Write a protein that holds these residues in place. Structure first.
Motif, PDB file in Angstrom:
ATOM      1  N   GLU A  80      16.282  19.021  23.516  1.00 52.61           N
ATOM      2  CA  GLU A  80      16.201  19.968  24.675  1.00 52.61           C
ATOM      3  C   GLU A  80      14.750  20.069  25.173  1.00 52.61           C
ATOM      4  OE1 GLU A  80      18.647  23.067  26.828  1.00 52.61           O
ATOM      5  OE2 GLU A  80      18.195  20.917  26.824  1.00 52.61           O
ATOM      6  N   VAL A  81      13.761  20.053  24.267  1.00 54.03           N
ATOM      7  CA  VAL A  81      12.306  20.020  24.616  1.00 54.03           C
ATOM      8  C   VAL A  81      11.889  18.572  24.907  1.00 54.03           C
ATOM      9  CG1 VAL A  81       9.950  20.425  23.780  1.00 54.03           C
ATOM     10  CG2 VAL A  81      11.737  22.116  23.320  1.00 54.03           C
ATOM     11  N   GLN A  82      11.296  18.341  26.082  1.00 51.81           N
ATOM     12  CA  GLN A  82      10.869  17.009  26.591  1.00 51.81           C
ATOM     13  C   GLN A  82       9.416  17.092  27.051  1.00 51.81           C
ATOM     14  OE1 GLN A  82      14.122  15.546  25.463  1.00 51.81           O
ATOM     15  NE2 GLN A  82      12.971  14.151  26.787  1.00 51.81           N
ATOM     16  N   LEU A  83       8.594  16.124  26.648  1.00 54.63           N
ATOM     17  CA  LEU A  83       7.277  15.833  27.269  1.00 54.63           C
ATOM     18  C   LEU A  83       7.277  14.359  27.668  1.00 54.63           C
ATOM     19  CD1 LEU A  83       4.953  17.822  24.843  1.00 54.63           C
ATOM     20  CD2 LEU A  83       5.646  18.454  27.148  1.00 54.63           C
ATOM     21  N   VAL A  84       7.205  14.071  28.968  1.00 52.00           N
ATOM     22  CA  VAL A  84       7.253  12.678  29.508  1.00 52.00           C
ATOM     23  C   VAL A  84       5.861  12.344  30.049  1.00 52.00           C
ATOM     24  CG1 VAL A  84       8.482  11.045  31.006  1.00 52.00           C
ATOM     25  CG2 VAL A  84       9.699  13.018  30.083  1.00 52.00           C
ATOM     26  N   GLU A  85       5.132  11.475  29.345  1.00 49.36           N
ATOM     27  CA  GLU A  85       3.823  10.928  29.784  1.00 49.36           C
ATOM     28  C   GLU A  85       4.068   9.833  30.826  1.00 49.36           C
ATOM     29  OE1 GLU A  85       4.423  11.316  26.442  1.00 49.36           O
ATOM     30  OE2 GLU A  85       2.606  12.015  25.423  1.00 49.36           O
ATOM     31  N   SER A  86       3.165   9.721  31.795  1.00 49.38           N
ATOM     32  CA  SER A  86       3.145   8.641  32.812  1.00 49.38           C
ATOM     33  C   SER A  86       1.702   8.434  33.260  1.00 49.38           C
ATOM     34  CB  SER A  86       4.063   8.955  33.977  1.00 49.38           C
ATOM     35  OG  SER A  86       3.674  10.158  34.621  1.00 49.38           O
ATOM     36  N   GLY A  87       1.442   7.324  33.955  1.00 53.10           N
ATOM     37  CA  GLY A  87       0.154   7.016  34.604  1.00 53.10           C
ATOM     38  C   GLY A  87      -0.744   6.142  33.746  1.00 53.10           C
ATOM     39  N   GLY A  88      -0.264   5.688  32.587  1.00 50.96           N
ATOM     40  CA  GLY A  88      -1.035   4.791  31.702  1.00 50.96           C
ATOM     41  C   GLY A  88      -0.986   3.363  32.225  1.00 50.96           C
ATOM     42  N   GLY A  89      -2.034   2.574  32.005  1.00 52.58           N
ATOM     43  CA  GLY A  89      -2.044   1.163  32.435  1.00 52.58           C
ATOM     44  C   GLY A  89      -3.392   0.515  32.213  1.00 52.58           C
ATOM     45  N   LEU A  90      -3.580  -0.662  32.813  1.00 57.27           N
ATOM     46  CA  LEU A  90      -4.793  -1.504  32.699  1.00 57.27           C
ATOM     47  C   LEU A  90      -5.830  -1.005  33.713  1.00 57.27           C
ATOM     48  CD1 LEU A  90      -6.278  -3.889  31.569  1.00 57.27           C
ATOM     49  CD2 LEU A  90      -4.973  -5.399  33.062  1.00 57.27           C
ATOM     50  N   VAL A  91      -7.082  -0.804  33.302  1.00 56.94           N
ATOM     51  CA  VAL A  91      -8.151  -0.331  34.229  1.00 56.94           C
ATOM     52  C   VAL A  91      -9.476  -0.990  33.847  1.00 56.94           C
ATOM     53  CG1 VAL A  91      -8.499   1.798  32.874  1.00 56.94           C
ATOM     54  CG2 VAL A  91      -9.257   1.712  35.254  1.00 56.94           C
TER      55      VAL A  91
ATOM     56  N   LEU B 155      -4.413  14.684  32.429  1.00 57.84           N
ATOM     57  CA  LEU B 155      -5.693  14.192  31.861  1.00 57.84           C
ATOM     58  C   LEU B 155      -6.304  13.210  32.868  1.00 57.84           C
ATOM     59  CD1 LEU B 155      -7.546  14.280  29.322  1.00 57.84           C
ATOM     60  CD2 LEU B 155      -6.412  12.180  28.593  1.00 57.84           C
ATOM     61  N   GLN B 156      -7.343  13.666  33.576  1.00 58.96           N
ATOM     62  CA  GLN B 156      -8.176  12.853  34.497  1.00 58.96           C
ATOM     63  C   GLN B 156      -9.263  12.186  33.658  1.00 58.96           C
ATOM     64  OE1 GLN B 156      -8.132  12.259  38.071  1.00 58.96           O
ATOM     65  NE2 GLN B 156      -9.582  10.740  37.300  1.00 58.96           N
TER      66      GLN B 156
ATOM     67  N   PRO C 191     -13.490  -1.361  33.077  1.00 59.96           N
ATOM     68  CA  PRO C 191     -14.550  -0.513  32.528  1.00 59.96           C
ATOM     69  C   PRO C 191     -15.351   0.132  33.669  1.00 59.96           C
ATOM     70  CG  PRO C 191     -14.539  -2.657  31.423  1.00 59.96           C
ATOM     71  CD  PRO C 191     -13.574  -2.745  32.591  1.00 59.96           C
ATOM     72  N   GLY C 192     -15.631   1.432  33.571  1.00 51.42           N
ATOM     73  CA  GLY C 192     -16.280   2.225  34.635  1.00 51.42           C
ATOM     74  C   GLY C 192     -15.247   2.843  35.560  1.00 51.42           C
ATOM     75  N   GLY C 193     -13.977   2.465  35.397  1.00 51.29           N
ATOM     76  CA  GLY C 193     -12.879   2.905  36.272  1.00 51.29           C
ATOM     77  C   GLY C 193     -12.426   4.308  35.937  1.00 51.29           C
ATOM     78  N   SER C 194     -11.380   4.760  36.621  1.00 57.74           N
ATOM     79  CA  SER C 194     -10.768   6.099  36.463  1.00 57.74           C
ATOM     80  C   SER C 194      -9.243   5.972  36.466  1.00 57.74           C
ATOM     81  CB  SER C 194     -11.250   7.031  37.540  1.00 57.74           C
ATOM     82  OG  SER C 194     -12.667   7.156  37.490  1.00 57.74           O
ATOM     83  N   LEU C 195      -8.568   6.938  35.851  1.00 57.56           N
ATOM     84  CA  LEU C 195      -7.092   6.980  35.705  1.00 57.56           C
ATOM     85  C   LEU C 195      -6.700   8.438  35.462  1.00 57.56           C
ATOM     86  CD1 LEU C 195      -5.258   4.391  35.681  1.00 57.56           C
ATOM     87  CD2 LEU C 195      -5.035   4.768  33.228  1.00 57.56           C
ATOM     88  N   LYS C 196      -5.568   8.882  36.009  1.00 57.84           N
ATOM     89  CA  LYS C 196      -5.012  10.238  35.783  1.00 57.84           C
ATOM     90  C   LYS C 196      -3.669  10.097  35.069  1.00 57.84           C
ATOM     91  CE  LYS C 196      -4.475  14.690  38.216  1.00 57.84           C
ATOM     92  NZ  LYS C 196      -3.189  14.537  38.937  1.00 57.84           N
ATOM     93  N   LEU C 197      -3.553  10.668  33.865  1.00 56.56           N
ATOM     94  CA  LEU C 197      -2.276  10.757  33.112  1.00 56.56           C
ATOM     95  C   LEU C 197      -1.591  12.080  33.452  1.00 56.56           C
ATOM     96  CD1 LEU C 197      -3.630   9.495  29.669  1.00 56.56           C
ATOM     97  CD2 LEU C 197      -2.874   8.142  31.627  1.00 56.56           C
TER      98      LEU C 197
END
Lengths: 211, 213
Positions: free
Chosen positions: A1-12, A83-84, A14-20
């Motif tokens: 019944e309790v769910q945490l779904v992560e998304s936004g992970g991938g290849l980036v 997570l930025q 060095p020096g780059g940015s990503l938001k999970l």
């Protein structure tokens, strides 16, 4: 019944940015303090940071390794935590997990590399001429991960999907095998379903005896 | 920053054994300690928090105890599905800190591998590379020697192995070895063999094929 779904992970880069993003259901989101934890392949759990509830003025605390680069945020109306990640380093390469302190999500891989995305080739490990072994070789991909199922998940018993091996080329290879009754080889169809999401590669490979 | 040092780093125990893991905090942390289980391929799961409170639905055979600096995690009767790495966590002050983890392995009776060899596919040979695969299925213990021969020549430096984690039911391992050759090298030789040495085999087992046939 309790769910945490992560998304936004991938290849980036060095020096780059990503938001999970971490989409929560099954609990009163606004009352819980949301945490990020990460794990590099074959290594231990490392706390990333925490965001407290509105009652605590959305107070945030960070591990020293990330402070100044990573920002945790929440949107209580969306039941989502973020997570930025800025000024990414190769050392930030890990599976990133989101938690409400009691439950964790499946986690999402962040790869910080200048290496190019490459989609795999899928080759049969054909059974011999009563237990038979057969499989699929998933060769020459980057980055992790690939997923393998058999007959769209209907075949699970006797399945071994091996950890990926990093080859000298800097590309990954992975084998998935299953043992089945030798009598079933003539009659029952065996398909490995391979998905390499980073390269948009989806393959269904029928594996049968060579004629 | 509060150090959490776990003991031991690795443990081997039999099914039904009482198993004990300790965690020492580098300061007083009251009861502000959690224990996590991480099974192969999965996210960590919370077992114990406030040093000794069991999280809901967690089996009664898992328990924690301790206060201040000394903490214990106990499995009363180790089950096959308890294969995992266990971690303690300190949560009185930021930054929260994890122990380095205890990898839990099960001792069981010797099981000989079933051995299978797979020739390279015609599809792959078109690419100019040939992968030959040896499978060792469902063996215990982990120690196993795989030797590749091509026309009687022992092959060294041109293979890689991968091993599964211990199976959650039968506590066995499986191992794949891939021999990588050029298509030209593959086409120049006849006899492809993997030879497996294992405590469970009375003498080494060889599986082979002849390229032509």
């Amino acid at each position: 019944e309790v769910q945490l779904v992560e998304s936004g992970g991938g290849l980036v880069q060095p020096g780059g940015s990503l938001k999970l993003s971490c989409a929560a259901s099954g609990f009163t989101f606004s009352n819980y303090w949301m945490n990020w934890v990460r794990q590099a392949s074959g290594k231990g759990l490392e706390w990333v940071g925490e965001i407290r509830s509105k009652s605590n003025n959305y107070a945030t605390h960070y591990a020293e390794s990330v402070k100044g680069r990573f920002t945790i945020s929440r949107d209580d109306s969306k039941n989502t935590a973020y997570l930025q990640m800025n000024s990414l380093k190769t050392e930030d390469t890990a599976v990133y997990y989101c938690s409400n302190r009691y439950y964790w999500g499946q986690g999402t891989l962040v790869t910080v590399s200048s290496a190019s995305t490459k989609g795999p080739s899928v080759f049969p490990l054909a059974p011999s001429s009563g237990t038979a072994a057969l499989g699929c070789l998933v060769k020459d991909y980057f980055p992790e991960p690939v997923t393998v199922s058999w007959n769209s998940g209907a075949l699970t018993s006797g399945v071994h999907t091996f950890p990926a091996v990093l080859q000298s080329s800097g590309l990954y290879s992975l084998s998935s095998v299953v043992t089945v009754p030798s009598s079933s080889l003539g009659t029952q169809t065996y398909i490995c379903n391979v998905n390499h999401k980073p390269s948009n590669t989806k393959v269904d490979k029928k594996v049968e005896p060579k004629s | 920053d509060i150090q959490m040092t776990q003991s031991p780093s690795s443990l081997s125990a039999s099914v039904g054994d009482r198993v004990t893991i300790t965690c020492k905090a580098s300061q007083d942390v009251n009861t502000a300690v959690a224990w996590y289980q991480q099974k192969p391929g999965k996210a960590p799961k919370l077992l114990i928090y406030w040093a000794s409170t069991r999280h809901t639905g967690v089996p009664s055979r898992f328990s924690g105890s301790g206060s201040g600096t000394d903490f214990t995690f106990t499995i009363s009767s180790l089950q096959p599905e308890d294969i995992a790495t266990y971690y303690c966590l300190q949560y009185i002050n930021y930054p929260y800190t994890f122990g380095q983890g205890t990898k839990l392995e099960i001792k069981r009776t010797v099981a000989a591998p079933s051995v299978f060899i797979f020739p390279p596919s015609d599809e792959q040979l078109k690419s100019g590379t040939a992968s030959v695969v040896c499978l060792l299925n469902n063996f215990y213990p982990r120690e196993a020697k795989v030797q590749w021969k091509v026309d009687n020549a022992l092959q060294s430096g041109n293979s890689q192995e991968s091993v599964t984690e211990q199976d959650s039911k039968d506590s066995t391992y499986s191992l794949s070895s891939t021999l990588t050759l050029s298509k030209a090298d593959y086409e120049k030789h006849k006899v492809y063999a993997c030879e497996v040495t294992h405590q469970g085999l009375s003498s080494p087992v060889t599986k082979s094929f002849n390229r032509g046939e």
